[PDB]
Design a protein around this ligand. Structure first.
Ligand SMILES: [Ca+2]
Ligand SMILES: [Ca+2]
Ligand SMILES: [Ca+2]
Ligand SMILES: [Ca+2]
Ligand SMILES: [Ca+2]
Ligand SMILES: [Ca+2]
Lengths: 219, 219
């Protein structure tokens, strides 16, 4: 909290009265003169200009707005101490502000409708097709992008509403029960879901369309 | 980053390889003798013992496990430097670790079923009752507990599904339309929802049972 300082952390999407005092930095030299503090770098004087500011006479670094981990995850500013006589009394101290994640992004399926086909007579347990979703949040150090899949519904609900099932982790849709009848119900429209936080958080849905078929090249 | 240090921040529910290097503290008498570091306090040697540790020979403060802002939001540890011949070279420095929030708690209705009554003939716009929900997350500096109410459904849906409406912020259910026939349908079972992140995040539901009647005491 002088001219020596470790990496600071600020959470994205914070609210409250802005600007907020992040940490303060000072120069011992101020007892022998008057010192003026300044910061430079992207987020400071270079674009995005203005996110961060430092009160000249006190060394108070502040954030002037809510951050967004997905736009810019880390900033690298430099502090400068200049004396009343326009003399650099300190060498530029690099300051690194890391933006910590928040779960503000719903998972997203790689397609709006995935399509597949299953052979009529396929033994229960046979793999049909796979669905996919991605989440913009931090998968390195949070569960804010830990996706778990589920089947919200089947259409038509015949013979019964549980013909297929999807592996909660992998997203692979398998045939759960027997009774696929191509001549009465040739196409299933399942509504899969993907929820982050291992199935607990924010969710999203996309459809999977399965075609029941007599495997052997039919006419 | 010598012996003076700003308050550290660690987000709750972090994942990854543990223990994670938090920040490195250093003493200045380590040039004359070998200095060993130790930390003390709740979270260190006092319950919850072991959350934080410090590498004796290096001064590397680490987190040995995922934190939970809802259990303990702030820790207060102290660092101690002792020279090879068992003598404190530096005073015990106070270290403050703050645990930042994460939206990992669903809102909750104060009741499992709220009950009310509306007089038959009540002018549209009249206030019927109020519903309530709370969220355990940080309302001081995040939206992780910003609740927004909505009516998911009405039962019976007669005369129609929009008999009532709830104020998204306050949670007050008012009569939206006219046509309250207590004779045939004297009871309405509404399913309200509360979702944090101002209606965008995690949600929960509870029912509201409205009983239409003849205002002036009927028997
Ligand atoms: Ca964001
Ligand atoms: Ca995020
Ligand atoms: Ca997410
Ligand atoms: Ca928690
Ligand atoms: Ca929380
Ligand atoms: Ca919450």
């Amino acid at each position: 909290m002088d001219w020596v300082i470790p990496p600071i952390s600020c959470p994205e999407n914070e609210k409250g009265e802005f600007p907020k005092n992040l940490v303060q930095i000072k120069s011992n030299r101020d007892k022998e003169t008057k010192v003026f503090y300044s910061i430079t770098g992207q987020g400071a004087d270079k674009p995005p200009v203005g996110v961060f500011i430092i009160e000249r006479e006190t060394g108070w670094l502040k954030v002037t707005q809510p951050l967004d981990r997905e736009a810019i995850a880390k900033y690298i500013l430099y502090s400068h101490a200049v004396s009343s006589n326009g003399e650099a009394v300190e060498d530029p101290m690099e300051i690194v502000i890391t933006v910590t994640d928040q779960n503000d992004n719903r998972p997203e399926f790689t397609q709006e409708v995935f399509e597949g086909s299953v052979a009529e007579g396929a033994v229960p347990g046979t793999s049909v097709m796979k669905v996919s979703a991605t989440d913009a949040d931090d998968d390195v150090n949070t569960y804010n992008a830990a996706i778990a899949y589920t089947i919200v519904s089947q259409d038509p609900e015949l013979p019964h509403k549980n013909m297929f099932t999807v592996n909660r982790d992998t997203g692979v849709i398998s045939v759960l029960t027997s009774g696929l009848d191509r001549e009465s119900y040739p196409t299933y429209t399942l509504v899969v879901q993907a929820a982050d936080l291992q199935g607990e958080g924010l969710s999203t849905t996309a459809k999977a369309v399965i075609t029941v078929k007599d495997i052997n090249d039919n006419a």
